Ligand binder design. Structure first.
Ligand SMILES: COc1cc(/C=C/CCCN2CCCN(CCC/C=C/c3cc(OC)c(OC)c(OC)c3)CC2)cc(OC)c1OC
Ligand SMILES: COc1cc(/C=C/CCCN2CCCN(CCC/C=C/c3cc(OC)c(OC)c(OC)c3)CC2)cc(OC)c1OC
Ligand SMILES: COc1cc(/C=C/CCCN2CCCN(CCC/C=C/c3cc(OC)c(OC)c(OC)c3)CC2)cc(OC)c1OC
Ligand SMILES: COc1cc(/C=C/CCCN2CCCN(CCC/C=C/c3cc(OC)c(OC)c(OC)c3)CC2)cc(OC)c1OC
Lengths: 121, 196, 233, 196, 212, 222, 222, 204, 196
């Protein structure tokens, strides 16, 4: 039952574990998206640390959440997987209970909420 | 209820409490459970009051008819009319009966007829719900050919214990004495038998 | 959910001009076997309260312990444990009525009927009933078991309503109770001759009488009773 | 009883489901579709206890749809049916078992084969040329045992079905208000726009 | 009791009786068997009075929380599936409910779900529920047109309940009428079956085997 | 087996006048064929101008009255001593009752007082929390002997204007309190004669804008 | 129902209350529960009322015929033997519970008989749902050698015990006195402690108030 | 399951000054289903009126049986049977079937043609006689009927009044019973003439 | 339960009776006539327990035929139904009651009126413009309460009845294989051969 407060305030009013999490983001491979008049594109950047990399079996940077919404990230990889699973499940549960797929905003608001909770637990 | 009949030198004595109960409510506290089916042939009744009054009434009728045809019936014969009614109607009776009487040929006699319709000739007989508690007492205290006073005491003591322990028993101790001298009715009140 | 085994029968009670009388016999039955005769079923709590109990005797014994403990704990950090902050009859009853109800509501009752008798510190008489169902009520007379069928009708002739209570002295009310106790011994097959009685008077306090016997019994007429309708000898 | 029929022909699987919904004495609906699409190439028909059927069906649909997005792969019909079989075998020993019977009809795009799976509420799964839940077998199995050929066209299979429904419409006491027919082939899932 | 709902060109007509019996005893002739979940959604009461009145009120609470989070009217689909899913969690515990969840949204049009304590949830155009249901169906089934006027639709629903109030011992008291539009619902009054019977008999010529 | 329920008799009655409300009950408490008490009242003042009766199984009825009185006090605590409105009280009782949907209070509940417009008001409840606002409702043992009388005498059911021959319903006038008290008393003396669980005493609690007052009348004691 | 019988020095008196019940409903507030077997042998009945009436009228009729045949006055011990043998035949399915009192040329008698066919003899007896209240009073105030007037008081009070304390008993007290050398004295409503109080209103309707569809005079005579 | 509750229906009788009244509902149903609105439960034999509630097949049988019996009575006796005599005939007839009874609650009403006095009585299904002088009630709304009567009834009502009273008793009590109603008939009865009115009432 | 329907119009009585006979899960016949002609102007339809149904009807038949021969006369409908009610009222208290419900439709030749009687197996009889036995009335009574006129022609009656049957085929869980319809008028009894 480890419940040590890791995310706390410091005297300037900053939460340093949340801020050091941002640093982890800056490090990650760049990601971009832009809105067309009738589309959205997601652009990402491939890591050039090493090659001999198998391209067809390495996890892509863009993930489908439902069949009409994608998520791309930047930062810790292993971390992003957890977030993606949670949203994919909420996408299904939302459809199971309301008989509609998630709006993009709803799903964003969901993922956002998950992260927020980890800053306060 | 607690009932017994005991044989002694001069004849036979029947005894009973006087309590009939409907559940925990004492419907009658001065019941007479000693019942005459002939001059010197009496019975102790226990079980369904209706079943047991009705049986006695029929037996009284039978021995009365017997008497006018063949004179006085034996105690054994009284027992037989009882057994016959109780055995052949065993499915629809809850009756446990002690038959007791006197002959000059035979002196005192005791037959017990339990739920079976079985019949048993005994030197003494206990029965009724209170009877269980005095099985040991009576087996240690019955002597054959006791005097009348001895016997009246043996019954007094036994029945006071049965009444003491069984809540289905109580009120007065009634006795009926059957000797050649004839027929004597005795009674004993709470204040007397309680403090024994 | 259970069934009673060793049991105590009627508890009877009424209130008179300056207090309450409550009584109960000294018997613990075991079905139809009248097993234990030295069973005290009146339980005085301090000096202003008696709780009378019928029903399962093991459960009674439990409630008994709960009441000593209620008294022990009222003393804890209470310098007024025998003054302005002593156990009141209404306190003990509300406590009891609370436990009975919870116990029934867990489908595991205390198999009892309880009457709590006493005088409140302002002099008021207290008489209230509670049983295994958590049901509660008050009346100038109260009885459990056969007592509610036989004792109440007698006691109610002394005290029919509220206004009769001031007119009823302790001599009259005690006599009524001792009578009722005899009637109960006549007609209830689970009763005993030996009983206990308690007066809780607002001037004389708690008076607790024990080893009483039902006296002055009429049994003589029984000698004149023979057969069951038709017999003559 | 609700009608749940299936037959797999040469290169396609046909599912026929009764359209009636009866609550006690009234037929509340005649336009009921007792199937859920699991994958683009897998259909499940269901019949059984009132609430359980759709709850189960939708639960299974959600799980298959979640698997599909997580892997960008459509699970094979045999795999989908092993998943369902385990879900019913779990429930049969739970506190309130889902009382639901199912047929699974799917085209295995990998093997280019139609497959048909029959599973009851207790986890008994079996793979079949044709199958039915409830009483539906009793009327139609003599028909299929006769006319069924492993190499039938979808047209022939639709005719064989037409026979089966006719036999059912004449010998069954209940009016099931006809059937909805659906085909699962390589191009996916379509509903016969007019049948009977 | 008898409750009905049906959809038509002009939205949804909802009609119910108002009798409550315990045994042979008529406990009330004045019960509201229509639950006003919120200004856009009606539910009907059949089976358990408390179970419907309670959970359908609770439904109203969940519907509001949805509108606050999502900033949009809840779909009749979603509203009904909340009720249904809840009820299904209690299956076997002895809840008793039979009910039409009724509403009019832009996405859906006039929509009726039947939802019961067995966990059943059905979209349909005509439903009747209760001891009197079989009578009301007969009137409805032979007069229902999609292109019913609104005036006429209101009549048909009223007449269908009257039908069942007459024949069923457990239905009666009065008829409560509702019209559900996209702007929400409109109450169309409480009509005592007493007076209504005679008026209908006289003016319509029906109920011929009754002396009046 | 153990039975957690019992029946303590009693009948209660609540009527809404247009600026007052009465709630009445007999005072006899019974068990089977025995009378437990001739005076054990079951109509209560719970503050905020609300009277309440929970008739049926007395333990449950007591328990429920306690819980509600206590929820009035906590409402006050939790909302800066806001008066509990009669409609809010009713909705709160629904929740109280429905909390035991699978081990119910074996009671029929009636509450009375004024609404937020000064008008008289009565709410009646299922054992499991169904509730409605009503003009009048008797409950308990003699409810069935009293309701038809009320339909006829309060709402003038089945009455028409003489000479109209059922063409004009006799017009609803509305009743003064003393007038309503008469109907309650006749209701109860009547039910007393024909119902063996009704008698001894009749206690009526009356609720106006001036608070809660209490009249008491004797009943036949057999 | 509460019925009692008390012996006194020169006869016997029986008493009963006047309340007939169907469940918790009082169907008759003045039922006569004292039945005549012969002119000087009377009966109080409790149990199924059709049975108590059926059985006293049957044995009543056979007793009359026996009387005409033997040219003797009817004996209590006979009505007893006939009642009990009829009841016993039906194994209690005839639910008659009876106190039988009377004077005949052999003296004065008091018995009780049960549905199953058992009989009891005593100087005082009670039966009914008020059986217990009544027997408490009798156990408290009975003595041997009661005068007539004393035995009426006693029997009368015992019934009052059941009227007040028992829910199944109510209304009036009926007494019959049969004394050795005199006619049986039958006192219908010897006591009436239960008069209903005057109503708070008269409920006479203004004529025309009921709605009528059809009239027609009816043909009594052919 | 309860034979006295399958068909439904009620009868109330009442005595006023030199008159008696007897009323019944018209309903006949099978449980919840209303079958007939014309099933009357009040019959007469000469000037004796008998109302029967309960199981309908027994109500019918009992009427046929009492016709039969009162016919042979008139034939042998040369007069019409009186109320008190009839009431005794009803009782002995019901008791004949003690262990297999008719499932009915009968009510007798009439005026003794010699003594002139008004008379009403009631019975259970095995013949015990309710000998009341005020009112007798029977059927599925017998509880409501009791409540209404105890209030509404005052003794010695003139016929025109007693009609208002007995109708209002019947009407409102039937409106509180699911199994009664669908119309009503009231018989006002005097020595000279007997008037029969059909009431108007809600048909639900 | 199977359909038993009757309407009495202006000058005739129509009887519609369901054609199906089902034992077990199979519908054993789709062309069953649930009427007997009792006299040439009196028709009786019936439904209930298997066996009892026909045995009773034919019993009644034989009886009314005997009377007709014996008196060279035809009992009125009212006389036939009273006869029938009484048979039923007898059997209800018998050791094994016939479980049979009947409609009796006849044209009274003296009175010149059609008459319809409904009698259930208890002996409950009533005369009716329209009647039914079983659940048949729950669906249909609403249509008849609405549309019935005592001045209706026979063809109008048949329209109303056709409507009634449509509502049964819609809302009733059972398939009763349609109805046989017979008319009883002043010319006697005829079968309408076309009721699809
Ligand atoms: C004094 O008057 C009273 C009489 C009675 C009634 C007494 C009758 C007792 C009834 N029984 C108790 C005696 C024993 N009994 C049967 C014995 C049970 C053993 C089972 C058994 C079954 C067999 O069948 C196969 C056996 O045969 C192998 C067997 O072997 C011995 C044993 C059943 C019947 C009850 C009373 O209240 C408490 C009472 O007090 C007023
Ligand atoms: C209109 O108001 C009324 C309604 C009703 C009847 C209410 C009908 C409501 C509709 N339904 C609610 C009632 C219940 N219902 C279905 C029954 C549920 C079966 C439970 C069950 C038990 C099991 O045993 C363990 C199961 O497992 C095998 C199981 O399957 C999972 C299910 C059907 C649908 C009756 C009335 O008369 C007094 C009435 O008027 C006052
Ligand atoms: C199985 O064996 C046993 C049976 C019993 C006895 C059980 C019950 C006793 C018998 N009775 C039960 C109680 C009922 N009863 C009726 C007496 C008189 C009825 C009064 C009455 C009440 C009414 O109102 C309810 C009436 O109006 C309808 C009325 O008519 C005038 C009369 C007599 C008989 C007791 C046992 O020991 C504990 C026992 O051993 C295990
Ligand atoms: C013992 O094992 C065997 C079974 C069989 C084959 C079984 C068939 C048996 C025949 N019967 C069974 C089926 C048919 N049957 C009548 C039962 C019909 C039930 C339908 C029904 C429907 C209802 O709804 C409308 C009812 O309600 C009115 C109703 O009445 C209660 C009944 C009676 C006879 C054949 C054998 O050969 C030697 C054999 O022995 C080796």
């Amino acid at each position: 039952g480890y419940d040590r407060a890791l995310s706390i305030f410091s005297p300037d009013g900053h939460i340093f574990q949340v801020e050091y999490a941002l640093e982890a983001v800056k490090r990650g491979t760049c990601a971009v998206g832009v809105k067309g008049k009738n589309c959205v594109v997601l652009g990402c950047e491939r890591r050039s640390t090493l090659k001999l990399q198998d391209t067809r079996i390495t996890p892509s940077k863009v993930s489908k959440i439902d069949s009409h919404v994608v998520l791309s990230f930047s930062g810790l990889n292993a971390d992003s997987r957890i977030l993606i699973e949670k949203a994919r499940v909420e996408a299904q549960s939302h459809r199971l209970t309301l008989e509609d797929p998630v709006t993009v905003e709803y799903l964003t608001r969901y993922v956002a909420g998950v992260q927020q909770r980890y800053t306060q637990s | 209820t607690s009932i017994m009949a005991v044989t002694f030198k001069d004849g036979v004595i029947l005894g009973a409490d006087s309590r009939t109960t409907t559940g925990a409510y004492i419907a009658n506290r001065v019941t007479d459970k000693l019942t005459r089916v002939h001059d010197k042939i009496w019975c102790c009744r226990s079980g369904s009051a209706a079943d047991t009054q009705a049986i006695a009434d029929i037996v009284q009728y039978h021995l009365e008819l017997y008497t006018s045809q063949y004179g006085t019936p034996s105690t054994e014969t009284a027992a037989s009319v009882f057994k016959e009614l109780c055995y052949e109607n065993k499915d629809n009776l809850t009756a446990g009966i002690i038959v007791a009487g006197y002959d000059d040929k035979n002196k005192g006699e005791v037959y017990t007829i339990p739920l079976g319709g079985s019949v048993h000739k005994l030197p003494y007989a206990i029965a009724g719900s209170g009877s269980t508690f005095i099985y040991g007492y009576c087996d240690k205290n019955f002597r054959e050919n006791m005097s009348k006073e001895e016997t009246v005491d043996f019954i007094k003591h036994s029945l006071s214990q049965a009444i003491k322990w069984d809540g289905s028993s109580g009120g007065v101790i009634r006795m009926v004495v059957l000797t050649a001298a004839g027929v004597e009715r005795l009674i004993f009140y709470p204040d007397e038998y309680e403090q024994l | 959910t259970q069934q009673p085994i060793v049991t105590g029968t009627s508890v009877i009670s009424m209130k008179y001009d300056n207090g309450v009388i409550i009584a109960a016999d000294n018997l613990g039955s075991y079905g139809s076997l009248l097993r234990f005769n030295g069973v005290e079923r009146l339980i005085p709590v301090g000096d202003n309260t008696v709780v009378g109990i019928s029903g399962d005797i093991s459960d009674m014994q439990h409630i008994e312990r709960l009441l000593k403990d209620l008294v022990t704990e009222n003393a804890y950090d209470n310098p007024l444990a025998d003054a302005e902050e002593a156990l009141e009859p209404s306190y003990i009853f509300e406590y009891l009525a609370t436990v009975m109800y919870q116990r029934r509501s867990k489908m595991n009752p205390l198999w009892n009927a309880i009457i709590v008798a006493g005088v409140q510190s302002n002099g008021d008489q207290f008489l209230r009933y509670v049983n295994l169902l958590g049901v509660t009520y008050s009346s100038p007379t109260l009885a459990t078991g056969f007592g509610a069928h036989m004792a109440n009708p007698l006691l109610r002739k002394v005290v029919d309503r509220e206004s009769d209570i001031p007119k009823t002295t302790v001599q009259v009310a005690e006599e009524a109770i001792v009578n009722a106790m005899r009637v109960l011994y006549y007609r209830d097959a689970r009763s005993s001759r030996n009983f206990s009685l308690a007066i809780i008077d607002k001037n004389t306090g708690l008076t607790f009488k024990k080893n009483l016997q039902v006296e002055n019994m009429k049994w003589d007429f029984a000698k004149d009773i023979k057969g069951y309708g038709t017999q003559k000898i | 009883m609700d009608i749940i029929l299936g037959i797999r022909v040469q290169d396609s699987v046909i599912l026929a489901s009764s359209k009636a919904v009866t609550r006690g004495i009234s037929v509340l609906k005649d336009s009921d579709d007792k199937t859920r699409q699991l994958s683009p190439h897998t259909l499940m028909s269901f019949a059984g206890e009132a609430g359980d059927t759709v709850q189960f069906a939708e639960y299974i649909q959600a799980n298959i749809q979640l698997y599909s997005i997580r892997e960008d792969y459509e699970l094979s019909p045999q795999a989908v049916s092993s998943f369902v079989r385990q879900e019913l075998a779990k429930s049969i020993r739970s506190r309130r078992p889902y009382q639901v019977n199912v047929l699974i009809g799917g085209y295995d795009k990998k093997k280019n084969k139609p497959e048909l799976y029959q599973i009851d509420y207790l986890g008994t799964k079996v793979e079949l040329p044709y199958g039915a839940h409830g009483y539906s077998g009793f009327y139609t199995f003599s028909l299929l045992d006769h006319h069924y050929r492993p190499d039938m066209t979808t047209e022939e299979g639709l005719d064989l079905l037409k026979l089966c429904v006719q036999e059912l419409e004449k010998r069954m006491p209940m009016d099931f208000k006809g059937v909805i027919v659906k085909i699962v082939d390589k191009d996916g899932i379509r509903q016969v726009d007019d049948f009977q | 009791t008898t409750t009905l709902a049906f959809r038509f060109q002009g939205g949804i007509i909802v009609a119910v009786d108002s009798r409550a019996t315990a045994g042979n005893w008529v406990a009330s002739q004045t019960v509201k068997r229509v639950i006003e979940i919120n200004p856009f959604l009606l539910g009907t009461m059949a089976g358990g009075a408390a179970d419907c009145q309670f959970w359908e009120t609770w439904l109203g609470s969940q519907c509001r929380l949805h509108e606050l989070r999502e900033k949009e009217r809840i779909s009749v689909a979603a509203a009904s599936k909340i009720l249904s899913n809840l009820v299904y969690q209690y299956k076997g515990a002895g809840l008793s409910m039979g009910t039409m969840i009724c509403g009019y949204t832009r996405k859906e049009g006039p929509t009726i779900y039947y939802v019961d304590s067995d966990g059943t949830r059905l979209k349909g155009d005509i439903f009747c529920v209760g001891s009197g249901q079989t009578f009301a169906y007969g009137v409805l089934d032979s007069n229902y047109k999609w292109d019913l006027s609104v005036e006429d639709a209101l009549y048909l629903g009223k007449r269908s309940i009257l039908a069942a109030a007459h024949r069923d011992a457990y239905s009666g008291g009065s008829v409560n009428l509702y019209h559900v539009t996209e702007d929400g619902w409109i109450y169309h009054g409480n009509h005592d079956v007493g007076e209504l019977f005679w008026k209908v008999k006289e003016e319509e010529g029906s109920f011929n085997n009754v002396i009046g | 087996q153990f039975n957690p329920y019992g029946d303590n008799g009693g009948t209660i009655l609540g009527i809404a006048g247009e600026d007052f409300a009465v709630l009445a009950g007999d005072t006899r408490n019974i068990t089977d064929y025995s009378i437990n008490s001739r005076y054990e009242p079951k109509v209560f003042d719970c503050g905020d101008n609300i009277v309440m009766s929970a008739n049926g199984f007395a333990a449950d009825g007591d328990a429920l009255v306690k819980r509600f009185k206590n929820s009035v006090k906590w409402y006050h605590f939790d909302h800066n001593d806001k008066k509990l409105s009669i409609n809010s009280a009713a909705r709160n009782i629904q929740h109280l009752l429905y909390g035991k949907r699978f081990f119910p209070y074996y009671v029929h509940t009636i509450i009375a007082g004024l609404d937020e417009d000064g008008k008289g008001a009565v709410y009646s409840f299922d054992p499991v929390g169904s509730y409605e606002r009503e003009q009048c409702r008797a409950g308990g043992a003699a409810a069935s002997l009293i309701m038809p009388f009320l339909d006829n005498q309060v709402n003038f059911k089945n009455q028409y204007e003489p000479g109209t021959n059922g063409k004009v319903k006799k017009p609803l006038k509305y009743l003064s309190v003393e007038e309503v008290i008469k109907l309650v008393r006749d209701s109860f003396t009547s039910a007393t004669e024909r119902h063996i669980q009704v008698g001894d005493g009749l206690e009526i609690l009356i609720v106006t804008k001036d608070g809660v007052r209490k009249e008491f009348y004797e009943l036949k004691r057999d | 129902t509460t019925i009692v019988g008390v012996k006194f020095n020169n006869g016997v008196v029986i008493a009963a209350d006047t309340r007939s019940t169907q469940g918790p409903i009082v169907a008759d507030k003045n039922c006569a529960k004292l039945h005549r077997i012969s002119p000087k042998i009377w009966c109080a009945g409790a149990g199924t009322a059709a049975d108590t009436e059926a059985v006293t009228q049957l044995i009543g009729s056979n007793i009359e015929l026996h009387s005409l045949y033997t040219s003797r006055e009817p004996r209590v011990v006979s009505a007893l033997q006939m009642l009990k043998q009829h009841l016993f035949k039906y194994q209690g399915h005839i639910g008659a519970y009876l106190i039988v009192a009377g004077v005949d040329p052999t003296g004065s008698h008091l018995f009780s008989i049960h549905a199953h066919g058992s009989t009891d003899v005593g100087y005082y007896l009670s039966l009914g749902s008020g059986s217990l209240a009544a027997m408490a009073v009798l156990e408290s105030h009975w003595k041997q050698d009661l005068t007539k007037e004393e035995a009426i008081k006693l029997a009368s009070d015992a019934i009052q015990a059941g009227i007040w304390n028992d829910l199944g008993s109510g209304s009036n007290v009926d007494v019959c006195v049969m004394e050795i050398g005199k006619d049986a004295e039958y006192l219908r409503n010897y006591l009436t402690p239960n008069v209903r109080e005057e109503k708070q209103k008269s409920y006479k309707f203004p004529r025309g108030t009921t709605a009528v569809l059809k009239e027609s005079i009816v043909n009594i005579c052919d | 399951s309860d034979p006295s509750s399958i068909n439904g229906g009620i009868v109330v009788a009442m005595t006023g000054k030199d008159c008696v009244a007897i009323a019944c509902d018209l309903r006949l149903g099978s449980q919840s289903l209303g079958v007939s609105n014309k099933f009357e439960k009040i019959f007469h034999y000469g000037h004796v009126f008998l109302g029967i509630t309960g199981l309908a097949t027994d109500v019918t049988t009992l009427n046929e049986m009492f016709r039969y019996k009162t016919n042979l009575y008139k034939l042998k006796e040369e007069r019409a049977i009186e109320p008190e005599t009839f009431t005794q005939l009803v009782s002995s007839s019901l008791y004949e079937r003690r262990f297999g009874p008719y499932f009915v609650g009968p009510v007798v009403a009439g005026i003794n043609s010699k003594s002139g006095k008004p008379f009403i009585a009631g019975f259970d299904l095995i013949g015990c006689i309710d000998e009341a002088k005020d009112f007798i009630v029977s059927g599925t709304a017998s509880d409501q009927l009791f409540g209404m009567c105890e209030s509404l009834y005052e003794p010695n009502l003139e016929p025109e009044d007693l009609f208002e009273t007995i109708s209002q008793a019947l009407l409102n009590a039937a409106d509180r019973d699911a199994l009664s109603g669908w119309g009503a008939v009231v018989y006002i009865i005097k020595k000279d003439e007997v008037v029969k009115r059909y009431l108007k009432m809600r048909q639900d």
